[PDB]
Short mmCIF file of C-alpha atoms in Angstrom, two decimals:
data_model
loop_
_atom_site.label_atom_id
_atom_site.label_comp_id
_atom_site.label_asym_id
_atom_site.label_seq_id
_atom_site.Cartn_x
_atom_site.Cartn_y
_atom_site.Cartn_z
CA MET A 1 -0.10 0.22 -0.05
CA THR A 2 1.25 3.47 -0.85
CA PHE A 3 -0.34 6.76 0.67
CA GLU A 4 0.41 10.36 -0.09
CA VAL A 5 -0.59 13.27 1.91
CA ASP A 6 -0.05 16.67 2.91
CA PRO A 7 2.98 17.55 4.70
CA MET A 8 3.11 19.00 8.11
CA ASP A 9 5.78 20.03 10.67
CA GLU A 10 5.22 17.81 13.35
CA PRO A 11 5.95 13.91 13.64
CA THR A 12 2.63 12.17 12.83
CA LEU A 13 1.36 8.63 12.75
CA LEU A 14 -0.97 6.94 10.16
CA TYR A 15 -3.66 4.73 11.90
CA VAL A 16 -4.88 1.78 9.74
CA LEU A 17 -7.63 -0.81 10.97
CA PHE A 18 -7.96 -4.17 9.05
CA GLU A 19 -11.30 -5.34 9.36
CA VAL A 20 -11.42 -8.84 10.44
CA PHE A 21 -13.78 -11.33 12.20
CA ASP A 22 -13.27 -11.57 16.09
CA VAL A 23 -15.21 -13.98 18.03
CA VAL A 24 -15.25 -16.00 21.54
CA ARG A 25 -17.22 -19.07 22.33
CA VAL A 26 -18.01 -19.78 25.95
CA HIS A 27 -18.56 -23.28 27.37
CA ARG A 28 -19.44 -24.14 30.94
CA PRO A 29 -19.65 -27.94 31.41
CA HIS A 30 -19.87 -28.61 35.32
CA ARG A 31 -19.99 -26.56 38.55
CA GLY A 32 -17.57 -23.83 38.86
CA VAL A 33 -15.72 -24.51 35.76
CA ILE A 34 -15.61 -21.86 32.78
CA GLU A 35 -13.68 -22.80 29.40
CA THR A 36 -13.23 -20.40 26.40
CA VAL A 37 -12.04 -20.32 22.81
CA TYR A 38 -11.07 -17.35 21.03
CA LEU A 39 -10.53 -16.68 17.20
CA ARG A 40 -9.75 -13.85 15.14
CA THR A 41 -9.32 -14.18 11.17
CA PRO A 42 -7.38 -13.43 8.77
CA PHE A 43 -4.54 -11.85 11.70
CA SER A 44 -4.74 -15.21 13.71
CA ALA A 45 -3.41 -14.77 17.26
CA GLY A 46 0.42 -15.63 17.13
CA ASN A 47 0.33 -14.73 13.59
CA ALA A 48 0.06 -11.05 13.57
CA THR A 49 2.69 -9.59 11.66
CA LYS B 1 -2.71 28.90 44.72
CA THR B 2 -3.89 30.81 47.78
CA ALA B 3 -7.44 28.72 47.77
CA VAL B 4 -8.78 27.94 51.12
CA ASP B 5 -9.79 24.61 52.95
CA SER B 6 -13.16 23.66 51.88
CA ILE B 7 -16.17 21.27 52.23
CA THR B 8 -18.61 19.69 49.68
CA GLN B 9 -22.41 20.02 49.00
CA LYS B 10 -24.59 17.54 47.28
CA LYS B 11 -28.32 17.59 46.21
CA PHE B 12 -30.64 16.64 43.56
CA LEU B 13 -33.77 18.12 41.82
CA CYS B 14 -36.80 16.56 40.51
CA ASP B 15 -40.00 17.70 39.49
CA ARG B 16 -43.19 16.98 37.55
CA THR B 17 -43.55 13.81 38.52
CA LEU B 18 -45.10 11.50 41.31
CA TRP B 19 -43.02 8.99 43.17
CA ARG B 20 -44.61 5.70 42.75
CA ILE B 21 -44.24 2.15 44.42
CA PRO B 22 -45.41 -0.71 42.44
CA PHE B 23 -47.48 -3.38 44.43
CA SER B 24 -45.61 -6.48 42.82
CA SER B 25 -43.23 -9.16 43.82
CA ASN B 26 -40.24 -8.45 41.94
CA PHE B 27 -41.24 -4.67 41.18
CA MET B 28 -41.60 -4.97 37.66
CA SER B 29 -44.38 -4.20 35.70
CA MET B 30 -45.62 -7.36 33.84
CA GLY B 31 -49.13 -6.46 33.54
CA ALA B 32 -52.10 -4.48 34.80
CA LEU B 33 -53.30 -6.77 37.59
CA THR B 34 -50.41 -7.42 39.49
CA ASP B 35 -49.50 -11.04 40.53
CA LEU B 36 -49.94 -9.90 44.09
CA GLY B 37 -53.50 -8.47 43.86
CA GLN B 38 -54.54 -12.07 42.41
CA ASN B 39 -52.38 -13.89 45.28
CA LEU B 40 -54.34 -11.56 47.97
CA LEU B 41 -57.88 -12.65 46.00
CA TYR B 42 -56.98 -16.08 46.29
CA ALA B 43 -55.97 -15.98 50.11
CA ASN B 44 -59.47 -14.09 50.67
CA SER B 45 -58.53 -12.37 54.06
CA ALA B 46 -58.69 -8.93 55.28
CA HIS B 47 -55.58 -6.81 56.64
CA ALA B 48 -55.10 -3.03 57.87
CA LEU B 49 -52.54 -0.62 57.06
CA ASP B 50 -49.98 1.73 58.73
CA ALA C 1 -58.96 -18.63 43.30
CA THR C 2 -58.89 -18.12 39.87
CA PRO C 3 -59.92 -14.86 38.64
CA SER C 4 -62.18 -16.31 35.76
CA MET C 5 -63.99 -18.00 38.71
CA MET C 6 -64.91 -14.63 40.29
CA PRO C 7 -68.26 -13.51 37.73
CA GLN C 8 -67.65 -9.79 38.34
CA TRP C 9 -64.19 -9.26 36.94
CA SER C 10 -65.22 -11.14 33.96
CA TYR C 11 -68.19 -9.12 33.55
CA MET C 12 -66.52 -5.89 33.51
CA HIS C 13 -63.42 -6.88 31.44
CA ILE C 14 -60.93 -6.69 34.38
CA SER C 15 -59.79 -10.39 33.14
CA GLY C 16 -61.23 -12.65 30.86
CA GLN C 17 -61.24 -12.52 26.96
CA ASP C 18 -59.98 -9.82 24.61
CA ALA C 19 -62.17 -7.62 22.76
CA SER C 20 -61.58 -9.84 19.32
CA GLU C 21 -63.45 -12.79 20.84
CA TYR C 22 -66.36 -11.97 22.77
CA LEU C 23 -67.82 -9.26 20.32
CA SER C 24 -70.59 -10.94 18.03
CA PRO C 25 -68.06 -11.81 14.64
CA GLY C 26 -70.44 -9.16 12.54
CA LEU C 27 -69.21 -6.31 14.35
CA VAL C 28 -65.46 -7.58 14.21
CA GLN C 29 -65.76 -7.84 10.61
CA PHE C 30 -67.37 -4.19 10.46
CA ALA C 31 -64.62 -2.70 12.68
CA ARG C 32 -61.86 -4.20 10.46
CA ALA C 33 -63.49 -3.25 7.58
CA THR C 34 -63.71 0.59 8.32
CA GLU C 35 -60.49 1.22 10.05
CA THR C 36 -59.36 4.17 8.21
CA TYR C 37 -62.15 6.44 8.42
CA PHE C 38 -64.36 5.52 11.17
CA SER C 39 -62.73 3.99 14.00
CA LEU C 40 -64.61 1.87 16.88
CA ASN C 41 -61.10 0.56 18.12
CA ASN C 42 -60.91 2.45 20.95
CA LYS C 43 -64.63 1.93 22.23
CA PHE C 44 -63.84 -1.71 24.31
CA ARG C 45 -61.03 -2.41 26.91
CA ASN C 46 -58.95 -5.74 26.64
CA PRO C 47 -57.83 -7.24 30.02
CA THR C 48 -54.40 -7.91 30.84
CA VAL C 49 -53.30 -10.36 33.48
CA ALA C 50 -49.48 -11.34 34.76
CA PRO C 51 -48.22 -15.16 35.31
CA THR C 52 -48.81 -16.14 38.90
CA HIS C 53 -46.84 -19.63 39.05
CA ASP C 54 -42.96 -20.10 38.98
CA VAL C 55 -41.88 -16.51 38.42
CA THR C 56 -40.78 -15.45 41.90
CA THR C 57 -39.50 -17.24 44.86
CA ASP C 58 -40.61 -16.76 48.26
CA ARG C 59 -37.53 -17.65 50.45
CA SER C 60 -35.29 -14.84 51.67
CA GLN C 61 -33.02 -13.74 49.27
CA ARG C 62 -31.40 -10.53 48.40
CA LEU C 63 -31.51 -8.25 45.46
CA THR C 64 -28.27 -6.54 45.48
CA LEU C 65 -25.12 -8.28 46.82
CA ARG C 66 -21.94 -6.23 47.83
CA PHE C 67 -18.59 -7.87 47.74
CA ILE C 68 -15.13 -6.80 49.96
CA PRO C 69 -11.77 -6.87 48.56
CA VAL C 70 -10.08 -10.29 49.29
CA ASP C 71 -6.97 -8.66 48.52
CA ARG C 72 -5.36 -5.61 47.66
CA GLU C 73 -1.83 -4.54 46.52
CA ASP C 74 -0.51 -0.81 45.71
CA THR C 75 2.43 0.64 43.92
CA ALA C 76 3.27 3.86 42.53
CA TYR C 77 1.46 4.11 39.27
CA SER C 78 -1.26 1.49 39.24
CA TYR C 79 -2.72 -0.87 41.84
CA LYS C 80 -4.54 -3.92 42.10
CA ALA C 81 -7.68 -5.59 43.54
CA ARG C 82 -8.74 -9.16 43.94
CA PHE C 83 -12.41 -10.14 44.94
CA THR C 84 -14.10 -13.53 45.40
CA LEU C 85 -17.31 -13.50 43.76
CA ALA C 86 -19.71 -16.20 44.48
CA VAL C 87 -23.08 -17.32 42.94
CA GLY C 88 -25.03 -19.56 45.18
CA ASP C 89 -27.29 -22.31 43.65
CA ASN C 90 -30.53 -21.89 41.92
CA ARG C 91 -29.32 -18.18 41.05
CA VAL C 92 -28.43 -16.78 37.51
CA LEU C 93 -26.31 -13.31 37.27
CA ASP C 94 -25.77 -11.37 34.57
CA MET C 95 -22.73 -9.82 34.22
CA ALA C 96 -24.01 -6.55 32.71
CA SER C 97 -25.36 -5.32 35.79
CA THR C 98 -22.01 -5.09 37.94
CA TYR C 99 -19.74 -2.35 38.51
CA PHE C 100 -16.78 -1.19 40.25
CA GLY D 1 -50.63 30.98 40.63
CA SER D 2 -50.57 27.35 39.24
CA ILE D 3 -52.37 24.85 41.06
CA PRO D 4 -50.24 21.78 41.64
CA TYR D 5 -52.92 19.35 42.73
CA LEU D 6 -55.19 20.05 39.28
CA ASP D 7 -52.89 21.00 36.24
CA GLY D 8 -50.00 18.67 37.33
CA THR D 9 -47.01 20.64 38.09
CA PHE D 10 -45.13 19.59 41.43
CA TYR D 11 -41.99 20.66 42.54
CA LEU D 12 -41.56 19.36 46.08
CA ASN D 13 -40.53 15.85 45.30
CA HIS D 14 -37.13 16.18 46.70
CA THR D 15 -38.12 17.17 50.54
CA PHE D 16 -39.12 13.48 51.40
CA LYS D 17 -36.39 11.38 53.52
CA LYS D 18 -37.95 7.82 54.08
CA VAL D 19 -41.16 6.14 53.77
CA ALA D 20 -42.41 2.93 56.04
CA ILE D 21 -45.14 0.48 55.39
CA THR D 22 -46.52 -1.90 57.89
CA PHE D 23 -49.62 -4.74 57.61
CA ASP D 24 -51.29 -5.83 60.63
CA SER D 25 -48.84 -3.95 63.12
CA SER D 26 -46.05 -6.49 62.87
CA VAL D 27 -45.79 -7.60 58.90
CA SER D 28 -43.05 -5.22 57.47
CA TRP D 29 -43.72 -5.01 53.36
CA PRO D 30 -42.07 -5.97 51.34
CA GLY D 31 -40.08 -8.01 53.86
CA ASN D 32 -38.52 -11.26 53.16
CA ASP D 33 -35.08 -9.05 53.09
CA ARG D 34 -35.09 -7.53 49.59
CA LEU D 35 -33.57 -4.11 49.93
CA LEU D 36 -30.15 -3.07 51.08
CA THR D 37 -32.07 -1.83 54.27
CA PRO D 38 -35.03 -3.97 54.15
CA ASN D 39 -36.91 -2.48 56.86
CA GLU D 40 -37.80 0.80 55.03
CA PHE D 41 -37.46 2.52 51.55
CA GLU D 42 -35.13 5.35 51.89
CA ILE D 43 -34.80 8.65 49.40
CA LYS D 44 -31.95 10.34 50.80
CA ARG D 45 -29.07 10.19 53.14
CA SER D 46 -27.65 13.28 54.90
CA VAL D 47 -24.43 11.71 56.08
CA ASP D 48 -23.27 8.35 54.33
CA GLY D 49 -20.80 6.08 55.86
CA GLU D 50 -20.78 3.03 53.84
CA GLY D 51 -20.95 4.37 50.04
CA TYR D 52 -24.77 4.27 49.37
CA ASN D 53 -25.35 6.99 47.21
CA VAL D 54 -25.30 7.08 42.91
CA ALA D 55 -24.84 8.89 40.40
CA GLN D 56 -22.64 11.52 42.41
CA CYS D 57 -25.78 12.28 44.23
CA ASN D 58 -27.32 11.86 47.49
CA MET D 59 -30.21 9.33 46.33
CA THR D 60 -29.70 5.84 47.91
CA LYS D 61 -28.90 3.20 45.49
CA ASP D 62 -32.27 1.68 45.88
CA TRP D 63 -34.38 4.14 45.30
CA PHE D 64 -32.85 4.48 41.89
CA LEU D 65 -33.36 1.03 41.18
CA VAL D 66 -36.97 0.95 42.23
CA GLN D 67 -37.85 3.83 40.09
CA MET D 68 -35.98 2.77 37.16
CA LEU D 69 -37.96 -0.65 37.42
CA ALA D 70 -41.45 0.81 38.16
CA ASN D 71 -40.92 2.80 35.04
CA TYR D 72 -39.07 1.32 32.44
CA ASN D 73 -38.53 -2.53 33.50
CA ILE D 74 -34.93 -1.63 33.54
CA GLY D 75 -32.29 -2.62 35.94
CA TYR D 76 -31.70 -6.45 36.38
CA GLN D 77 -29.65 -6.39 33.17
CA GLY D 78 -27.37 -2.92 33.52
CA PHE D 79 -28.43 0.56 33.38
CA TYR D 80 -28.76 2.56 30.39
CA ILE D 81 -30.58 5.72 28.68
CA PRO D 82 -33.94 4.47 27.95
CA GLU D 83 -35.47 4.91 24.46
CA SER D 84 -37.26 8.59 23.83
CA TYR D 85 -40.86 6.97 23.23
CA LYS D 86 -41.04 5.15 26.48
CA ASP D 87 -39.68 8.50 28.21
CA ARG D 88 -42.55 10.89 28.16
CA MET D 89 -42.36 14.41 29.54
CA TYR D 90 -43.73 13.47 32.90
CA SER D 91 -41.41 10.54 33.55
CA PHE D 92 -38.70 10.36 35.97
CA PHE D 93 -35.42 10.15 34.18
CA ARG D 94 -36.23 12.82 31.84
CA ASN D 95 -36.56 15.10 35.26
CA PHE D 96 -33.47 13.82 37.46
CA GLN D 97 -30.76 16.46 37.89
CA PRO D 98 -27.80 16.22 40.60
CA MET D 99 -26.06 19.22 41.70
CA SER D 100 -22.92 19.76 43.62
CA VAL E 1 4.34 19.32 36.61
CA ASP E 2 1.31 21.56 38.10
CA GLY E 3 1.04 19.53 41.28
CA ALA E 4 -2.19 17.77 40.61
CA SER E 5 -3.10 14.69 42.71
CA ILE E 6 -5.33 12.04 43.53
CA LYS E 7 -5.69 9.59 46.14
CA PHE E 8 -8.00 6.04 46.13
CA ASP E 9 -9.20 5.01 49.73
CA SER E 10 -11.50 2.20 48.87
CA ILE E 11 -13.13 -0.32 46.50
CA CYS E 12 -16.41 -2.53 46.90
CA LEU E 13 -17.87 -4.66 44.16
CA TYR E 14 -21.74 -4.55 43.54
CA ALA E 15 -24.06 -7.14 41.70
CA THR E 16 -27.65 -7.59 41.16
CA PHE E 17 -29.62 -10.76 41.12
CA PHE E 18 -32.89 -11.40 39.63
CA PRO E 19 -35.20 -13.23 42.31
CA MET E 20 -36.31 -15.88 40.02
CA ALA E 21 -38.31 -18.95 41.34
CA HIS E 22 -36.06 -21.61 42.38
CA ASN E 23 -37.09 -24.60 40.17
CA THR E 24 -37.21 -22.18 37.16
CA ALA E 25 -33.67 -21.34 37.56
CA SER E 26 -32.64 -24.75 38.41
CA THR E 27 -34.19 -25.98 34.82
CA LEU E 28 -32.48 -23.02 33.21
CA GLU E 29 -29.06 -23.82 34.73
CA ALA E 30 -29.52 -27.55 33.63
CA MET E 31 -29.94 -26.49 30.10
CA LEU E 32 -27.70 -23.83 29.77
CA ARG E 33 -24.56 -26.57 30.27
CA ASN E 34 -25.02 -28.91 27.40
CA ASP E 35 -22.22 -28.18 24.91
CA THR E 36 -24.38 -27.19 22.31
CA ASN E 37 -25.82 -24.02 24.30
CA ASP E 38 -22.57 -22.15 24.37
CA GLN E 39 -22.62 -18.46 24.14
CA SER E 40 -20.86 -16.27 21.63
CA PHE E 41 -19.81 -13.00 21.34
CA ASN E 42 -18.34 -10.81 18.99
CA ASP E 43 -16.60 -7.22 19.50
CA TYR E 44 -18.05 -4.47 17.66
CA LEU E 45 -15.20 -2.66 15.94
CA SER E 46 -13.57 -5.86 15.29
CA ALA E 47 -10.10 -5.24 13.60
CA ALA E 48 -6.48 -5.18 13.95
CA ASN E 49 -4.86 -2.07 14.29
CA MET E 50 -1.40 -0.71 13.14
CA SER F 1 -12.45 -31.37 16.62
CA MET F 2 -16.03 -32.44 15.08
CA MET F 3 -16.59 -29.12 13.34
CA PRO F 4 -14.65 -26.88 10.97
CA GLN F 5 -13.77 -23.56 12.49
CA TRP F 6 -15.98 -21.24 10.69
CA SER F 7 -18.94 -23.36 11.46
CA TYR F 8 -18.08 -23.56 15.14
CA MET F 9 -18.03 -19.60 15.94
CA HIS F 10 -21.23 -19.57 13.73
CA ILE F 11 -19.67 -17.28 11.10
CA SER F 12 -21.15 -19.10 8.62
CA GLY F 13 -23.67 -21.57 9.53
CA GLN F 14 -27.29 -22.50 11.01
CA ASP F 15 -29.31 -19.65 12.72
CA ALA F 16 -29.90 -19.16 16.18
CA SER F 17 -33.09 -21.33 16.34
CA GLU F 18 -31.26 -24.09 14.40
CA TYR F 19 -28.50 -25.25 16.54
CA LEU F 20 -30.13 -24.77 20.13
CA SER F 21 -32.06 -27.67 21.83
CA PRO F 22 -36.01 -27.26 21.54
CA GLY F 23 -36.26 -26.62 25.26
CA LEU F 24 -34.18 -23.33 25.08
CA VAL F 25 -35.92 -22.24 22.26
CA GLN F 26 -39.36 -22.56 23.83
CA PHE F 27 -37.86 -21.13 27.28
CA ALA F 28 -36.45 -18.07 25.36
CA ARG F 29 -39.95 -17.42 23.38
CA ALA F 30 -41.53 -17.86 27.09
CA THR F 31 -40.20 -15.12 28.93
CA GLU F 32 -39.00 -12.53 26.16
CA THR F 33 -40.77 -9.73 28.09
CA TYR F 34 -39.04 -9.23 31.15
CA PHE F 35 -35.60 -11.39 31.20
CA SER F 36 -34.26 -11.59 27.58
CA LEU F 37 -31.71 -13.89 26.30
CA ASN F 38 -31.74 -12.55 22.57
CA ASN F 39 -28.13 -10.97 22.63
CA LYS F 40 -26.21 -13.81 24.08
CA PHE F 41 -26.25 -15.95 21.11
CA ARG F 42 -24.83 -15.40 17.53
CA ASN F 43 -26.75 -15.11 14.04
CA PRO F 44 -24.27 -15.59 11.08
CA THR F 45 -25.15 -13.64 7.79
CA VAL F 46 -23.29 -14.49 4.58
CA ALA F 47 -23.54 -12.58 1.09
#
């Protein structure tokens, strides 16, 4: 990707959001136990960049 | 930088409304004929109020 | 007893059937026919009743609970608190109604 | 001037302190140990010692919960701003102003 | 630099329970544990930032 | 491990009224007015 912007006399940041799917599934089998499964695609956790 | 030791006061204002207390079991509004009215009909007795 | 066993509350439509039913069918069809320019829809009251079975308990049980920090630790810039949230049996708690 | 008993404009709602209800001289409605101070409702506290006021005001939590429930069926699943169509001119949340 | 300050004293946690009838709540609890009635959730912005 | 990932988190699969036990569906229809469970489950949409 290549961006072309106006100039300014101050250090600045380009803030980019890639829209993805992020979801959680929570499951509670027995008493006093709670387990979860996380997922985020296409930037899977532990494979960010 | 020359202010004085101070205390705080709080209050609230509320107008154009009646304070209301519903005669239900869980205070929600599930219907016109709230269940406690039916229950008291079922018991079929009398009481006095203070 | 059941309200429908009490006759008066049925007679005055405090409890019973809706207005869509106890009217003779001809009048109901008439009223549905001319709703746009001559409305009869507010000349009759429909009763509403609330459930009375298996909705609300009768034991002693509080509506709001208040928990104390079991542990608290402090630092120069940020401090940490740790509570023990207990949900007894025969209850369900929605986390949308908790705050610090 | 105006006549609150007829036209419907009241302004002294903030001078109540508390209300107590009893049936048959011993029964204490609503009883069954529901409220944070179950014996009697409680609108305003002069001096708090245990943190019982909300909205940065002096209205005991309770009263806030009871009013929200009785008006909008809101409070067992978190507080939020009720929609406009359910909050008319004479409602509660439209006319709740805290000051300090 | 300008001498602002803040000191926290205490915390307490508050929670509210629906006073649902006991056997109804027991039935609901029993149903909601089967591993085909899990709960799902999805953030609202949803995205990865750089 | 008996389902693919997409169909697991309900990204693309059956709707809420199709992967719930019938008892829970009937219960949710029963008490929708005063204690709601509508927003605790997903509803996949596809193009």
